[PDB]
Every structure is written in structure tokens, then in C-alpha cells.
Scaffold this motif. Structure first.
Motif, PDB file in Angstrom:
ATOM      1  N   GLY A   1       0.778  -1.245   0.000  1.00 38.69           N
ATOM      2  CA  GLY A   1       0.000   0.000   0.000  1.00 38.69           C
ATOM      3  C   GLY A   1       0.801   1.283   0.000  1.00 38.69           C
ATOM      4  N   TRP A   2       2.123   1.152   0.113  1.00 36.22           N
ATOM      5  CA  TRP A   2       3.046   2.297   0.117  1.00 36.22           C
ATOM      6  C   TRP A   2       2.929   3.057  -1.211  1.00 36.22           C
ATOM      7  CZ3 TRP A   2       8.463   3.320  -1.736  1.00 36.22           C
ATOM      8  CH2 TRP A   2       9.001   4.491  -1.187  1.00 36.22           C
ATOM      9  N   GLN A   3       2.531   4.305  -1.104  1.00 40.71           N
ATOM     10  CA  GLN A   3       2.332   5.189  -2.250  1.00 40.71           C
ATOM     11  C   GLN A   3       3.578   5.781  -2.877  1.00 40.71           C
ATOM     12  OE1 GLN A   3      -1.507   6.982  -0.523  1.00 40.71           O
ATOM     13  NE2 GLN A   3      -1.267   7.765  -2.599  1.00 40.71           N
ATOM     14  N   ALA A   4       4.736   5.514  -2.341  1.00 42.70           N
ATOM     15  CA  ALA A   4       6.061   5.891  -2.800  1.00 42.70           C
ATOM     16  C   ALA A   4       6.436   7.372  -2.720  1.00 42.70           C
ATOM     17  CB  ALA A   4       6.345   5.320  -4.188  1.00 42.70           C
TER      18      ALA A   4
ATOM     19  N   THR B   1      -1.202   5.631  -6.427  1.00 43.52           N
ATOM     20  CA  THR B   1      -2.484   5.958  -5.811  1.00 43.52           C
ATOM     21  C   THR B   1      -2.648   4.983  -4.628  1.00 43.52           C
ATOM     22  OG1 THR B   1      -3.863   4.635  -7.438  1.00 43.52           O
ATOM     23  CG2 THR B   1      -3.619   7.033  -7.854  1.00 43.52           C
ATOM     24  N   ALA B   2      -3.597   5.387  -3.784  1.00 47.27           N
ATOM     25  CA  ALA B   2      -3.944   4.650  -2.563  1.00 47.27           C
ATOM     26  C   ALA B   2      -4.542   3.290  -2.841  1.00 47.27           C
ATOM     27  CB  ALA B   2      -4.883   5.544  -1.765  1.00 47.27           C
TER      28      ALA B   2
ATOM     29  N   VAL C   1      -9.716  -3.473   1.228  1.00 52.20           N
ATOM     30  CA  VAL C   1     -10.489  -4.637   0.760  1.00 52.20           C
ATOM     31  C   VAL C   1      -9.810  -5.275  -0.440  1.00 52.20           C
ATOM     32  CG1 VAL C   1     -12.734  -5.365  -0.036  1.00 52.20           C
ATOM     33  CG2 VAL C   1     -12.524  -3.802   1.953  1.00 52.20           C
ATOM     34  N   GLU C   2      -9.348  -4.466  -1.362  1.00 52.58           N
ATOM     35  CA  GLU C   2      -8.638  -4.946  -2.560  1.00 52.58           C
ATOM     36  C   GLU C   2      -7.318  -5.611  -2.176  1.00 52.58           C
ATOM     37  OE1 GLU C   2      -7.734  -2.091  -5.751  1.00 52.58           O
ATOM     38  OE2 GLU C   2      -6.670  -3.703  -6.722  1.00 52.58           O
ATOM     39  N   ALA C   3      -6.590  -4.985  -1.255  1.00 52.15           N
ATOM     40  CA  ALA C   3      -5.338  -5.527  -0.738  1.00 52.15           C
ATOM     41  C   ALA C   3      -5.619  -6.936  -0.226  1.00 52.15           C
ATOM     42  CB  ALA C   3      -4.803  -4.623   0.360  1.00 52.15           C
ATOM     43  N   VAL C   4      -6.679  -7.105   0.568  1.00 51.83           N
ATOM     44  CA  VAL C   4      -7.062  -8.415   1.108  1.00 51.83           C
ATOM     45  C   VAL C   4      -7.253  -9.457  -0.004  1.00 51.83           C
ATOM     46  CG1 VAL C   4      -8.684  -9.737   2.588  1.00 51.83           C
ATOM     47  CG2 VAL C   4      -8.250  -7.301   3.059  1.00 51.83           C
TER      48      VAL C   4
END
Lengths: 392, 392, 392, 392
Positions: D17-20, D30-31, D35-38
């Protein structure tokens, strides 16, 4: 003591203007107004101010706005008497430069980076700047197979050759100073040390227009001796500018006040720049502070830290001079044979033929007797430190 | 795999001959006879041997003694077919060199240092050596005030110019390679990184006869990227020789077998040297191992460690070749745009005037859209490691 | 400022007696006689002397010889009024110790290592020493698969438990101080930092008897804050002894005079040890200098360097005191809230239930407002440095 | 190779999730929706996900928002079968934490930090988390005089003792894992290494509920041996969790994919964790990746990098297994006496008196003869690397 304009203390707008957003947290300070910065710096003793294009005029400002900002900025300089000795360009913040500016794998990014710098060269020339500092913070890689170093050096050279061409043709009279840094933000940055940067500059088309802008912390990030690297830079005559700050060895870039990191090396550096040959300083450019007020501080800590840079340099200067003027130091320098290094190894007119003929240099040389004599370096170092502590 | 003479693997007499006396303990091994070292090395596949004057002929040997050693040495070389590609001089062991060789504060030491070197050049030239390596291990300081760097660089240059002169006059045809080291044995060593040595070399009277002999661990002692500094040495065309070994970042000089330190950097180094431009290697000199068999080993461990250096190089070379012939790696390289850096940034015949005219380079540049494209560097790095791991 | 017995400056026999034989060169100084050393140290103000068994009695001396040396030594002690606060054992020089003493892979060396120490314990007991320092310089490895760390810790523990048993049975009253070092001579040494050593000690059979002997330079070789690790050691009450010296970050062990490396940290360290709790020192043991006179020095340099250690400490002490007494410093300390940290976070009798009921600790807490106030840490740091430079 | 739930691979939501947004540039990505990460992680083979309170619920969300977010996240775990093995609290981003959470000099900040954590403990308990990780990123200083380390340790302890009290009283059954880091973001962080964190934990009220969560790059930032450090943690039984990633020595915190930094150390590490006593792993918790997809990558690059971590771990395991199984390795292990360290130094029931009476342990011991046998360590090491390289 007190700073005079002859001390030539300069500061970047991004220094006292750092809002303190670090890799792990939000900004702790509000934005600093540039006109105010001019005023505050003028008040603490700075003789000049510097900035990245994007520090002054927000990225993506229309012509009207940009023009507007510059004109207000020029008035503040006017009113205060501060000059702009150097200007630089931001080629590291915007996402488009994630793989670099001049050496981006992407050709369209390289072309855009050049355009962005030409434009800052114009503003610089118009404000009276003499030096263009170039910091390739995004030039490098995290992974070895991702960047062809030879091709990157070719593209780096190709962009600098053009900038020199332009400046000479427009009659700007700028000098270019490459700033080396070993890492951060890239895993490995191209031209990691003052040495690599001087070797590179020597390969350019008009090398006489290029030098370096070494920063105290950058060399210390690799655990190198800053004073010794600056002495090599001066030997080569490539010390076009210098960034002063503090660092506590190999770790993230701290940007502390000058002399707040390696105190002993800050002392020897001030001594080298000021106790130059013929009494006079070995270096005559700006003493520029590229540091950051700690994140724990408010605007008062900000001005406090700005003043600390000046006070540190002046207190060290004062002790370096007392050091050199001490008769006991003079006696220790003699016993250490520091000045004997300045006399040529060969007598005038001697070449290898005459050296070979000197039995005293080899055949009859008593290496053992010579090897038994001490140099008195510890005593000499102890005297330097006692001068630094104000104990003598 | 097996090493061929075409691989050009060479070892210093002082590597396999290190008796393992370290800073905290006595030797754990008895001395190695040079003739025996010649035979053993030939047997494991080396094509050459190198040595410091004092490795072969004990310091202070009378001429009869020295002559006998040299003659037995040459017979061994003869009989095995090994050559002597480089020779060097010990300017660091004897107490006389405690403050350096060419840059000692003491003038007489400087004169003796040059004569020690001239004498070794004669012996090198008679053995057929093409390179003279210069490692100024004692040139430097523990304290900043003990050494005038500028005077030191002047003295360094003064000695090197004489050596070039003598060589050229004698028709020896030697090339000189300065070997940089940041520290150990001095607190700080002059010409600390490959960059510093290259910039210095450029100031000599005959720069074309001078290059560098960079060592893997030396640059790693400063936590610098060795492959990337070699890439830059190659760009300047100053890679005259190379010392291969292993190190674990900033700590004392470990001198591990090549590849036993930073494996990933060893891999990318072998890729750079062998997969040069035009199918062919980018470098053609010796692949010299300047390492030390660990203090925990006996003579069996010594030969095992000599063989490990060659195995390490050949295994990495095999994986580097497979890497580049992979069509998947090739596709990743194209996606990461590595080769696009090799294309000039400016169009043929385009100058600043035309660049300033290209609105696609600025006015109409969509920085934001470009800024969002990924380079695929992680994926590329992953394929590289899968090749090294023999997983592909 | 002059040294008093109350200052408790002690030196190891091996510091002033170091012949300066390094990893790359021969000894530049002749052997120092122990009776002589006692006499010379007594003269510069040392209150005590320490030694490894092998520094006093040459490895392998017959009993007659050994007995003779001790008698002479004791007489010199007698005459000068010098004590022996600590003794240690050389478990690193002899080749048998190449893979360690207590943790060597070889069971027989481990057994011998214990006998060598028991023997030194008796002698220390005999001379009145209160501390046994254990420096496991050969415990560790160059390669990860060569050493089973778990088993090594078991064996390190097994050995220490026995030593304490013996000391306790015999009524020696010794305290045991483990000395941590990250590397050199081994690639990695077991118990690399002050922290690792304290954690280990907590696992022995009589932990109350064990502490640490941290060395300035050893923590700095990893770029750690020495003052800050000593603070934690004091917190655990495990600072049993201290070795003072100087170092320039991560590189080989330099053993400079105390204060010649990181001066700022040398200052904060003296402040910590002296401006203790009451008004009284926070640390009551010997101020032991474990350094080496630089290789470039003769015996005049050696005595100069011994004196320099004492001089640096006394000068720093003087400025630390002045710093704390400055009303301006008091004010800066108040603004930075240094003392507020000593007030418990919780009110007396408050637990999690009470904290959870406090709306002001969270629900009504204005984090934004608190986050905008500065701590004034730069200003406090600047006053400290000015005290150090004798600028106030 | 394929990942199974039995592999226990977990990822922090803040990793992929790191946006750099680094210290020198804006975010390039982007963020990522929690839920998508899961769903993505479930898909690449992960068994669990971890998060900081502020990663899932934006700092300052009302309970309505907060509640909604928790509900959806809970559904996603539900549908995918992913678990939450650990949770942590963000005590470093918000400006209020500029001087620390638990050890801020400001008392109000300390009260606030505890409340923030109690709250996160509640959510953790509700999601079934077993470990609370505490990373004191802001606990420390940039200047020595700004922080009373002793007072700080008292306050760190005070806070932790309350947390254990609460969890035990609420019956949450959590384990607390302190994560050590030497620096970044503070100049120096309290409890800089695995060693310091372990020593500190031994001083808490209920030490059995506390352990450490060491991170690969954290120990490597000080140039320590990560594998050796874990070995010690395991000896103490304090390895409660582990963060895997890559780093290139002492420089800023890189957070590369596991094995993309010191590859040799990554190998010895998997060997340590997996080839535990009696076939079984020496470690049973989550194999958690706390890394960052490089700034040059897009979401494609992100998923790639997530998979690379699993891939690296599984390829290493496979080779570690093969290494140990090789009768040739088995033979080299025997010759190097690696397992002999497991045999007590002392015979059964043997004490100081029996050891003192054993002539073979000293009087009749031939140190010179034992000092000459080699350990065969280079050969064992070369066998390990050939296994790693897939050449054996």
C-alpha cells in the motif's frame, strides 16, 4: 562574534523553509513565505539566498503567477541587500523523475529535465547568480541490472555539454557545480563521491566551466574524511561551491547544523578554508548551509538553528586562527614535519638518473634508524583539540 | 567448469602465502615457498602470479641471495608456463614507512621510497610484467593537522612523474595502476575511492600511462557500489587492472574469496566485465584475486580457497550469460528501458535552440502521465536473482 | 587540571606497551618493561594498571620465571601506590584460539580456555583485583554455516557459570564484565553490542555477578550512540567497568585517545558519568583507557598520548559541569522538557481503567496543537557545544 | 514452488500500500483499498495481513466511519480466509509524536500514546490477533542533551507494564513484540538492536509476555549479522515475530524484497529458521514481509514484488534443505566440528576442582599442535553457496 557580508554566509530557501515531513511523518511546520525568509535571513547575517525553481514558484504555476512571485522576490532582495549567488533545479520531487532526470531510462523524461533546467538558467542569469548547482538525486538505481552506468554517464555528459553551450552563447557566465551523494533517495546514486564527480567533469567538453559542490554530510554518509576530500578538490581547483551541514556517519541524511555532527572534522575544514596560503583563505566562494532545522522545532527553533550555523563557523574560525598562531602548535608542527612535505622529494634538476646514483637514498639508507623516530602526531592533535575546547 | 589460460586468473604470492598473523594473533600457518606456490597455482589453473618485492626477496637480502631467489623463481615460471602480469612494491610493512612512502613528512623516506620502487620496476620489466600497481597504504593520517593534503598530493604526483619518465626512457612499456583504499592501516588513506584516484591520475604529466587497480572490498568498506564504480572506471577507460575479493560492508578489510561477501554485486560485476559491448568482455586484463585464506584454515583450506575464487567467477559467468540470452530477461530489459539510455537525448543535429523550440519537451509535456508509468525494476531484479540461484 | 587518585584513571599494560605491529607492518617500538610502565603511569596520575596474563608473563614461562616476574611487579605496585582494579586473559593471540576460546568448535580448546582463565583469576585475586574482564574476540565466525550460535551461547554460558562457581567457593569476590565488539578479528563476533551482552548475562546462573565492559570504539564501529547505550547499561545497573577510547565510525578498530574520534559524544558521555543523580557521579568504577599510541610515535609520543587521555577527560568534565550550572542551560532544559520525562506518565494509583476514563488523554486531546509546539532541542545542543568550545 | 497457508506468509497493509512518497519526492502510486489488498494478497498465497491502526482507519475518522471500515475489512477476511496474526499502532506519523509516543518529553503526549495503543489492542483482540508489535520509531533523539535515556527507559517500561496489565485483565492473551531499529527517523532510536530490546524486556513486570520483532534491514543498517542476531534471539526464546526484507548495509532504510539485499545472509537465515532441531523449523510464527515496492513501480510492479518475497523465501528454503541433506555437506560439517559445539565443555558432574586436576586441559596440553589444524570453513562455505546457486 558577528557575521559580516564578507563572511559570505548563504542559505537555501528549502533549508529554513523545510516543513519537516520526513519519510515517516507529516510536516510539523507551516509553509515559509519567501519574502519573509529573505527578511529573516538578512537579519541574522546571511549575504545571499539560493533556491530550487520549485521552492520559489510552485510546480505548474501559470506565467502570470510565476512572474508575480519573481517580482515580489526581487523587491525583497532589493530592499534587504541579499544576492542570489547560486540557483539549482528540482529534478527529484515530481513522480516523472522517479528514475532520474538526465539519466532516466525514459528518453522523454531526459528531454523534459533539460528543458526544466534551461528555464532556471534564464531566471538565474536574470537574478545575477554565478553558479548552477546540479544535484542528480534520482540518478542511480536500486537494482544493478536496471541501469546501464556507461550509457547513463554518456547521457549525463550530453546534457551538461548542452547547458554549457547555451550559457556561453547567451553570455550568462555561469559555472556548473555537480553535487555528489552516495545514496538517498536512490539505493545507489551516480557520482557517489567528490572524487567520482571530479573524474567525470574532466571528461566534459568545456571542463573549465565545471567543478563540484561537495556537502559535508554526503561524504560522511560513506564514512570518508570530508576535510581531506575538500583538500583534494582544492588541489584540482574544482571547489566551485560548498554545502555545509552535520552528519553522524553512515545512516540516513541528517542535515544537522554545521559542526553538530563530526566536530573535529568541522574544525579542520574551517582551518583548511581559512588558513590558506599567503595568510588568506584557500576558498573564496559562498559558505552555504544546506541543513534542516530538526522536526521537533517550531519557527523559533528554525531561526535559532539558522543562527547556530553562523555561530559554529565563526567560533571554529576563531580557534583555527589561534591554533596556527600558537607558538607551541608551531613547535609541534615542526616536530611533525608537516611543512617538510612541501619541499620537493627531488633536488632541483634531479631525475631518475641522479636519484639512482644517490647511494644515500637506498644502498646506504638506514631504514631502521629512520623507522624508530616518532612524528609527534598525538601531541599535535591534542593541541588542536585544546584550542577547539577553548582550553588554551 | 574448468579455468583455461584464457580466463586469465592470477593470484598474488601474498594471498595463498598469508601466514594468518592478524591484528590480534600469531600466524597459524608456516611460510609458503614461492616455487611451491608457482607449481600449486599452475595446477589449479592460474595463468599468472604477482608479488611485492618483499614477498619474493626478504627485505634486506644481499645481492647474491636475491639473485639466487630470482633465478629459482624464473625456472619455476618457465617450467609451469605461468607469467607475471603485474608486480608491486611493499611501501607499508617496514617501520620506516609508518607515515607513508611517497608522502611521508620525512624527506629522506620519500627519496628511499622512490628508489625501492625503481628497483622493482627493473625486476618487473625483466620478468615481463606490463603493470606496476601502486597501493599507498601508509599515505594518509590519523589526525587532520598531521598532514598537509595538498603538499601530499604534490609529492605523490612528483614521485609518479619520475617513475613514468624512467619507464619511458628505459623502454619498459609499463602502465601504472593506483589502488584506492579508504582506511586501514591509516585512519584515513589519501585517494580513498576509485573516483578520487581517477581524478588524481588526470593531473599527472603523462595521464595516458596511468589508471586504477580498484579492489572489491575496498569500495565496499565505504558501502559504495563496486560494479557501478567499475562501470565509471570503464567509461573513463582507466580500468588497468582489478583486485577481486569479498567483504561484508564497512568493517576491517576481510579479504574473503570473491563472491563470499556481497554475492549480488559479484554477479552484476561478472555480467559487466564479460557481457561487454559486442558480445565480448568489456575488460581484458587479468582477473586478479587479492584475498586471504581465513585464519582458521591449514594448507588444505588454502588451496580449497584458491580454487573457490575461480569456481565462484566461472559459476557467476555462466549465470550471467544465461541471464542475457533469456528471452524473458530480454523482455524485462526492454520493459525497463535499460537500452534506451544508450540513445542520445538530443536528436542528431539538435542543439539548445531546437530543444527550446520543442513544446513536447516542456510546454506540452505531460509530466504527470509519464510519472505514473512503472519501470518494472523489481521484476527484472527478481529474474537476475533466479538466474544466480540456478532456479531458471 | 591535574589528575587525582579519586579520578580513578587506569590503563592497560598493553595500551602504552603496544609495539605498533599492525595488520600491514612491523613493530615500530621496542618492548615496554612492566616495572617501567608502572613507574611511568604512576607519574602521569594513573591510580591503577590492568593486564592480560600474557602481557606480564610471556606465554609459556616456567614457574620460576613466572614467579620471578610477579614478585617484581608487586614490588613496583608497592612502591608507586598503584592498584590493580581489573585483570583479563588473552584468549585471542595464540593460534589454538583461532576459532575461539570458550566457543571454539574444538572441545579440547574450550577446556584449555577455562584452565587459562582460572589461572588468571587466582593471580587477580592475589593482586586484589575486583573485576575480571572477558573479551571474546575470537568467538564468532567468518561464514554462517561454520558456527552454531545456539550451541555457542550454551558453551559461553557453561564456561561462565563455572568461573562464578569457583570465585564464589574460593571467596574471591570478583565481578565479571563481558566486553562486546561487533567484529575484528572475526567477521562477526558473538554478543556484538552492549545490548546483546546485557541480554546474555541475564541468562546465567548468578546474574548478579555479571555485567558488561563496553568500549567507546566498539559501539561506534556499528555507528551506535555510545552515550545512549551507556545510559541503558546504567538503567539495568550492569555498567561494571568501562573502556574509553576514540573511533571514526565503522572501519577497523582505531583505538585513538579518548575524545580524538567523536568529540560531541565524548562530551555527552562525561556529562552522563559525572553529572549523576545527586550531584554525584552516576558511575563509581575505574575510568579505564583501552587505546593505542599511533604507530607513527616513539616513546615520547606514547607518554604524550597517555597524558592526552587524562587531559581530554578532565577538560570535558570541566565543561560538562559548567554546562549544567548555566542558568541559560537550565532555562533551555526547562523549555525542552527534559525533566518532565522523569515524572511518571500515570498519576499515582492510576491503571488502565482510570486512563481509559480520561477523555482528555484521547477523546478530547488536541494532538494538532501539541504537535505544533517546538522542543527547542537545537538551541540546547548549541549551548552544550559552546560550553565544550570554552565559548561560554 | 507454491505457497501454502502452512508457510505463514503475511504482509503489512502499509507494504503493498506504500504510495512511494519518499523524503525527496511525491507519491508515484495511488492509494490501495484495504479490501482490494485483502483480495490480492489472498490470491498471491498469503495466509494473513497486518496493519497499523491508521493504515485501515484514517487518523480522526468518527466512530460511524471507523465502524463501517472495520465491518467491510472483516467481510473481506471472511470471504478470503485470511487471518490477522498481528496488529500495530502508528506512534510516528502525526506531528504530536515528533519527540516520541511513550517517551515524548511532553507528559500529555505520553498519556495520549497509551490511549491510542489500548484502543488498537481492542480491535486486535476482536480480529483474533495474537501479537501486538511496538515499533518506537520516534523514541530517541538527534542531540545528546535533549533526552534523559534513563528517564526514557522508565517511561517506556511504565507504559508497557500497563499494556500487559490490561491485556491480561481483559483476557486478550496477546504477546508483545518490541521492534528494534538503530536510527531513522530519529538521529538515534532507543533500543537500537535486537540485543538492547531483549535486555530491556527482561526488566518488565511480566517478561514472559514480551519478546522482539527484529527486522532484517534494521540490524543490517548497523552492519550486524542478522542471522547471528536471530540465533541469539532464539537462544533466549524471545523471537516472537519477524519482519523480513532486504537492505544494502549502513544507509537509509531501503525495505527491498527479502533476499534482494545481503543474499548470503538471507540464505543462512532461512536455513536457521527452517532446519531446526529434529527436522522441524526452529521458528513457528508468521514469516512477515515488511518491505516496500520500489518507487519506480506501478501496481503491476507492486504485485510482482509481493510475489517476489514469497518466491525468494521458497527458493532459499529449497536450497537450505538440499545443503543439509548433502552427504558432502554432512561430511564437511563433521570436519569443521560444527556439532562438537553442542557437547558440553565439562564432563558430567565435573566442576572447577576436577578441571583444575586435569593436566590434559592445561599442563600437558599441546596448544601449538592443536593451533595448526585447519577448520575447513572455506570449503563448507563454498558448498553452501553452490547449493544456493543451484550448482549442486
Amino acid at each position: 562574534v558577528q557575521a559580516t557580508r564578507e563572511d559570505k554566509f548563504s542559505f537555501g530557501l528549502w533549508t529554513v523553509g523545510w516543513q519537516a515531513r520526513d519519510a515517516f511523518g507529516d510536516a510539523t511546520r507551516t509553509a515559509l513565505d519567501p519574502v519573509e525568509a529573505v527578511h529573516k535571513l538578512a537579519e541574522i547575517g546571511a549575504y545571499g539566498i539560493t533556491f530550487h525553481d520549485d521552492d520559489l514558484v510552485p510546480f505548474g504555476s501559470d506565467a502570470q503567477t510565476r512572474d508575480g512571485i519573481i517580482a515580489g522576490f526581487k523587491k525583497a532582495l532589493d530592499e534587504t541587500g541579499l544576492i542570489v549567488p547560486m540557483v539549482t533545479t528540482n529534478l527529484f520531487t515530481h513522480p516523472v523523475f522517479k528514475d532520474g532526470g538526465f539519466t532516466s531510462n525514459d528518453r522523454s523524461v531526459r528531454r523534459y529535465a533539460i528543458r526544466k533546467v534551461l528555464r532556471q538558467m534564464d531566471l538565474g542569469a536574470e537574478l545575477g547568480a554565478k553558479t548552477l548547482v546540479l544535484w542528480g538525486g534520482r540518478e542511480g538505481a536500486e537494482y544493478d541490472s536496471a541501469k546501464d552506468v556507461s550509457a547513463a554517464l554518456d547521457r549525463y555528459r550530453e546534457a551538461l555539454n548542452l547547458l554549457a553551450q547555451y550559457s556561453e552563447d547567451r553570455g550568462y557566465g555561469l559555472r556548473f557545480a555537480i553535487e555528489p551523494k552516495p545514496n538517498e533517495p536512490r539505493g545507489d546514486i551516480l557520482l557517489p563521491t567528490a572524487g567520482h564527480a571530479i573524474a567525470f567533469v574532466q571528461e566534459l567538453e568545456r571542463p573549465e566551466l565545471f567543478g563540484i559542490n561537495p556537502e559535508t554530510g554526503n561524504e560522511q554518509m560513506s564514512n570518508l574524511n570530508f576535510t581531506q576530500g575538500i583538500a583534494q578538490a582544492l588541489w584540482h581547483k574544482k571547489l566551485f561551491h560548498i554545502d555545509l551541514n552535520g552528519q553522524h556517519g553512515p545512516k540516513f541524511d541528517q542535515d544537522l547544523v554545521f559542526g553538530h555532527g563530526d566536530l573535529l572534522n568541522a574544525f579542520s575544514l574551517v582551518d583548511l578554508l581559512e588558513n590558506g596560503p599567503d595568510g588568506a583563505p584557500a576558498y573564496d566562494g559562498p559558505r552555504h548551509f544546506d541543513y534542516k532545522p530538526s522536526r521537533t522545532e517550531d519557527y523559533d527553533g528554525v531561526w535559532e538553528s539558522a543562527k547556530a550555523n553562523i555561530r559554529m563557523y565563526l567560533l571554529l574560525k576563531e580557534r583555527a586562527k589561534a591554533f596556527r598562531a600558537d607558538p607551541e602548535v608551531q613547535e609541534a608542527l615542526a616536530a611533525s614535519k608537516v611543512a617538510e612535505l612541501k619541499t620537493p622529494t627531488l633536488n632541483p634538476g634531479e631525475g631518475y638518473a641522479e636519484l639512482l646514483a644517490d647511494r644515500s637514498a637506498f644502498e646506504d639508507y638506514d631504514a631502521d634508524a629512520v623507522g624508530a623516530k616518532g612524528f609527534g602526531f598525538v601531541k599535535l592533535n591534542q593541541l588542536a583539540i585544546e584550542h577547539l575546547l577553548g582550553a588554551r
